[PDB]
Design a binder for this molecule. Structure first.
Ligand code: FEC
Ligand code: FEC
Ligand SMILES: [Fe+3]
Ligand SMILES: [Fe+3]
Ligand SMILES: [Fe+3]
Ligand SMILES: [Fe+3]
Ligand SMILES: [Fe+3]
Ligand SMILES: [Fe+3]
Ligand SMILES: [Fe+3]
Ligand SMILES: [Fe+3]
Ligand SMILES: [Fe+3]
Ligand SMILES: [Fe+3]
Ligand SMILES: [Fe+3]
Lengths: 170, 169, 170, 170, 170, 82
């Protein structure tokens, strides 16, 4: 395609990815709110830290969309599922991460076909992070299935802190 | 009637929370524009205010959970994009004023429902919303009275909001 | 081809890239001398710092050329334009960086086609640095376009320091 | 026997021991990859730490063989068993350690018979370390046997770190 | 092909790579024992440090295989040549590293064809380390060729230490 | 549920053994035989609760999936007045 054609094709997959991150942020934070309510500290903390990774993916996608002359979407891709039980959280989060990695690896092929090396590299780095998320969700899911409440009894009452309060305006 | 009272508070908490989710997306959309323009200082403060709204959304969600509700995931109203710089501050100033009005109403319900803990949460957040309002009012005024003279001062300034966000990876 | 052919094809695009770097070094330093003479310190400093990134690029390209048995070129690609006014400096530097990314992306392709993974990673790294340079030049060109002498008035008489004198022999 | 007769008999028990070490390295690292995959951090870490002792043993046997003028073998003794369940891992590793102590004690007797005091002291030191491995594996197999999933729930999700990465070349 | 098919084809080239690392570890350590015996310390030190790099590669390949649900091989590919003279050591090691880089670049392509970005990145990073190994071996070969016993006289009696002993279990 | 009930039955058998002893000291053979009979039934409860508790602790979800949706009938309705 011409210069504009290529930019538009990449801005499209970037916005698709961004909508996926916007979904994960609301989905993972919903789950964090449940986990925190159950007082499963370590689990709630790590869920919020992964959601913050997704916020940063969302931001990186938007920044690159701006670099290419586009407008960052404000809509999340899909619907947020609430009230999930603990076994369901980790099962569905692992599935979701695996799907994202499949999706982003195709998005990557698009960028390479449209000759956009900078965007392809963004996708490669974020796919490596999604892999870290997948592995985490799978490990929790497997202990829960194999060890049940014995494992959860260990997590009950642990600290849920994610560190010092974040940089804000006030 | 404990359950009527929890239900009516949870309803305004979810209302305020959806106003926070909209604000987060609205202010970050403007942040990306300001950053693209290379008006660093303005871009940095717009993201810092977005992060304040994230913290409001979270506090509202946690209280909703304490009251046995489900925190909403949907934002109230539409995000406006491609806003020009004068419109960003004018519209952010208007939305912050509308939020203080809305939350003072929500505060009222909390007090009527005998929910002191939630009333205090709204009072605290309202005073932060006033800090944001004042900020947006001041920037809008400078832009209106000094125009490009004020912007040349913002051009090229750093946009960093601090050290990278705590994460999982 | 055999090993020699594939190496020779990569040496050819590395030396074309290197020739483009040698050009950018002389073109950006020429502009640096003007910016400095005009006493727009921050602009002059950053133009020289970008010039030094290009020096490092030229060096990295020649090191890879050496690894593959080739000889690093000493000729620059193209003519250095002198006497440019400030708006023209940033307009043409952004065009030149954009063109470089275009070119290096093709070169990247050659590397992949010849099975040279180490050389492909070098171009990938360097293209991301060029993207940073592109953004900088676009950003300046936009302030000059939108704010003109009101913006340059803020830059007038700023420090032009790029730091302590670079390591030398004497 | 004669001087070279004596060296050769020692070199032979040394090469038998070294082949047992090469096997141990691959057998315990295999178990480590499984324990790690299962996310039993503390079990995975100590398993890798023991394999690294076996690496040191292999190396010390090889340095002594060179001293005696022999050639250190490069072939492991026996087959590596894969897919073992957790109890079989600790059951089989303890038997392997007990067997190694037995063989090594016989190798030690050969060194004394061949009047090789330095090599015998090498065996003495290593048998003491193998005794430390044996006790370890017997202890874990005993907890798994007595406490089962309750013990494993405790290890689930523990850190698997064995320290800072290897000294290496790059 | 299907998801399971795609994992199977990547697991196969990962086990091919790992078997090559297992060979390199035994090959390089074998040469390390000769150089140490010869009291060429700097050479013995670096050869062992490169062998530790290959250990880390084998480990990284094993971990990815596990992530993909495969079983890490325990067998090395090819025969370890022993009794090499010093010049033969560096010629063959250089030749061995270039061949590794050729093979790994092929394995990389399979990863890409199977849509496995995380595994392609793993190979990309290890190919860069192998290139550092290749340059090293080529440089020592050049010095032995160009300077002979003069260069060896320099290395004679040098420290052979690779630092502090590796944390282990005992 | 099963952890606590096992402990409860174990406590009951210990207490009733002590009560049985008081009956023997008061020369009340009929009452002691009553405790004897009921202690043997408490032992069957204890054994029941300990076995379930073990399966839950050790086998988790596969065990409960077997119990999910099974019949909960305890037989024909109790004799009553109506
Ligand atoms: C809470 C909460 C919400 C609401 C979730 C919900 O559904 O309730 C929540 C929602 C969002 C949403 C959307 C976005 C995406 C904005 C967009 O791209 O349109 C979104 C975007 C960002 N968040 Fe966010 N948030 N958020 C935190 C809390 C919450 N956040 C905390 C805490 C930190 C702390 C970071 C730190 O300390 O390093 C934090 C950081 C960021 C960064 C900072 C990136 C960086 O500089 O590295 C970006 C961008
Ligand atoms: C000696 C010796 C042998 C025997 C070879 C022979 O043929 O004699 C030897 C053999 C092996 C073999 C196989 C493997 C591959 C195992 C497998 O994946 O099946 C194998 C695997 C590893 N070794 Fe190994 N060794 N080895 C050292 C010495 C020796 N090593 C020293 C020293 C360190 C010190 C590490 C450090 O402090 O960084 C060290 C560390 C490692 C690590 C950990 C690296 C890391 O975490 O970064 C892994 C994995
Ligand atoms: Fe993400
Ligand atoms: Fe993710
Ligand atoms: Fe707010
Ligand atoms: Fe606000
Ligand atoms: Fe360059
Ligand atoms: Fe450049
Ligand atoms: Fe040993
Ligand atoms: Fe041992
Ligand atoms: Fe390697
Ligand atoms: Fe290598
Ligand atoms: Fe009972």
């Amino acid at each position: 395609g011409n210069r504009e054609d290529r930019k538009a094709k990449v801005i499209e997959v970037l916005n698709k990815a961004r909508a996926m991150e916007l979904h994960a942020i609301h989905q993972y934070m919903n789950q964090h709110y449940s986990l925190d309510d159950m007082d499963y500290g370590e689990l709630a903390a790590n869920m919020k830290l992964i959601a913050i990774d997704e916020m940063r993916h969302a931001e990186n996608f938007a920044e690159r969309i701006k670099e290419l002359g586009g407008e960052p979407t404000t809509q999340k891709e899909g619907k947020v599922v609430t009230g999930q039980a603990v076994p369901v959280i980790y099962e569905s989060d692992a599935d979701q991460e695996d799907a994202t990695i499949e999706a982003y690896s195709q998005f990557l092929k698009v960028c390479k076909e449209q000759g956009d090396i900078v965007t392809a590299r963004l996708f490669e780095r974020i796919i490596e992070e999604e892999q870290a998320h997948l592995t985490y969700y799978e490990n929790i899911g497997s202990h829960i299935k194999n060890l049940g409440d014995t494992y959860l009894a260990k997590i009950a009452g642990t600290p849920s802190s994610t560190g010092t309060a974040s940089k804000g305006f006030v």
